[PDB]
Scaffold this active site. Structure first.
Site, PDB file in Angstrom:
ATOM      1  N   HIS A  41       0.820  -1.212   0.000  1.00 41.44           N
ATOM      2  CA  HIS A  41       0.000   0.000   0.000  1.00 41.44           C
ATOM      3  C   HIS A  41       0.862   1.274   0.000  1.00 41.44           C
ATOM      4  O   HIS A  41       0.343   2.385  -0.002  1.00 41.44           O
ATOM      5  CB  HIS A  41      -1.032   0.011   1.166  1.00 41.44           C
ATOM      6  CG  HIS A  41      -0.459   0.288   2.519  1.00 41.44           C
ATOM      7  ND1 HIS A  41      -0.127  -0.713   3.409  1.00 41.44           N
ATOM      8  CD2 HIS A  41      -0.208   1.454   3.161  1.00 41.44           C
ATOM      9  CE1 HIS A  41       0.296  -0.178   4.542  1.00 41.44           C
ATOM     10  NE2 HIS A  41       0.256   1.140   4.418  1.00 41.44           N
ATOM     11  N   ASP A  86       0.255  -7.942   1.968  1.00 41.90           N
ATOM     12  CA  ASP A  86       0.728  -6.586   1.933  1.00 41.90           C
ATOM     13  C   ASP A  86       2.244  -6.399   1.832  1.00 41.90           C
ATOM     14  O   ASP A  86       2.892  -5.948   2.766  1.00 41.90           O
ATOM     15  CB  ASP A  86       0.173  -5.848   3.161  1.00 41.90           C
ATOM     16  CG  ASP A  86       0.303  -4.342   3.035  1.00 41.90           C
ATOM     17  OD1 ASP A  86       0.697  -3.860   1.935  1.00 41.90           O
ATOM     18  OD2 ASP A  86      -0.008  -3.649   4.034  1.00 41.90           O
ATOM     19  N   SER A 177       3.843   2.591   8.316  1.00 42.60           N
ATOM     20  CA  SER A 177       3.585   1.623   7.252  1.00 42.60           C
ATOM     21  C   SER A 177       4.858   1.193   6.535  1.00 42.60           C
ATOM     22  O   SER A 177       5.717   2.034   6.238  1.00 42.60           O
ATOM     23  CB  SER A 177       2.615   2.199   6.201  1.00 42.60           C
ATOM     24  OG  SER A 177       1.306   2.358   6.715  1.00 42.60           O
TER      25      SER A 177
END
Ligand SMILES: NC(=[NH2+])c1ccc(N)cc1
Ligand SMILES: [Cl-]
Ligand code: NA
Ligand code: NA
Ligand code: NI
Ligand code: NI
Length: 223
Positions: A41, A86, A177
């Site tokens: 992402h 992810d 992240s």
């Protein structure tokens, strides 16, 4: 990083900053001289990747290496199902020169075991809601798959694992992240997602379960 401390300068040599001209939107992890691993992402058509940093100002680190990259290889099952798989490999334009402050780390072969005392680092949101000036470090403990799967059902997928969720309220958060979760000197996971507010008791953060992708990573990198 919620309730952590400044990391000792250069103590997480594999940490990479994915930056823009103004902001820092994600981190990544150097897993090979020419490859940085991050969360899918965090994708961009091209990146300016900062290695060997502590504060985000490159001039403050004589050994920092700000490198360009434009080739990203996202896992083909990313977001299927929602939020799963992810991870993404970013191939740097030129290999970095490993040093005392910049080093690649190997990926865990062993999968996360409940109770393992690990470390996550990043420049993301703090408990007060502000961003730090230097890299933050916090310890979080791996949670069992049984608890993780039931807490996050139906979002839980085997490409994920949980860590944190204790009363100490230590957790990663927005801006962390793609950053690393280190267990036993190996890269065990990537900061993936969690719930807001960050650091709720009984609500651990979710990380990319890298022990499930070493073959794909090796294949991508080597080939
Ligand atoms: N672990 C978390 N609370 C978290 C991690 C990443 C993120 N983008 C938001 C929240
Ligand atoms: Cl547990
Ligand atoms: Na995930
Ligand atoms: Na793993
Ligand atoms: Ni700036
Ligand atoms: Ni320094």
């Amino acid at each position: 990083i919620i309730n952590g401390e400044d990391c000792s300068p250069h103590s997480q040599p594999w940490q990479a900053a994915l930056v823009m001209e103004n902001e820092l939107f994600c981190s990544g992890v150097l897993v090979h001289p020419q490859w940085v691993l991050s969360a899918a992402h965090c994708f961009q058509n091209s990146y300016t990747i900062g290695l060997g940093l502590h504060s985000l100002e490159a001039d403050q680190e004589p050994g920092s290496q700000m490198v360009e990259a434009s080739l990203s290889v996202r896992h083909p099952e990313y977001n299927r199902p929602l939020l799963a798989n992810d991870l993404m490999l970013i191939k740097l334009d030129e290999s970095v020169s490993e040093s005392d402050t910049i080093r690649s780390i190997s990926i865990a072969s062993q999968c996360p075991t409940a109770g393992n005392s690990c470390l996550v680092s990043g420049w993301g949101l703090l408990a007060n809601g502000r961003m730090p000036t230097v890299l933050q470090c916090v310890n979080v403990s791996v949670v069992s798959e049984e608890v993780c799967s039931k807490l996050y059902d139906p979002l839980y997928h085997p490409s994920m694992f949980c860590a944190g969720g204790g009363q100490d309220q230590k957790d990663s958060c927005n801006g962390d992240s793609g950053g690393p979760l280190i267990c036993n000197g190996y890269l065990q996971g990537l900061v993936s997602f969690g719930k807001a507010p960050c650091g709720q008791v009984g609500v651990p953060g979710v990380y990319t379960n890298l022990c499930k992708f070493t073959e794909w990573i090796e294949k991508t990198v080597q080939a």
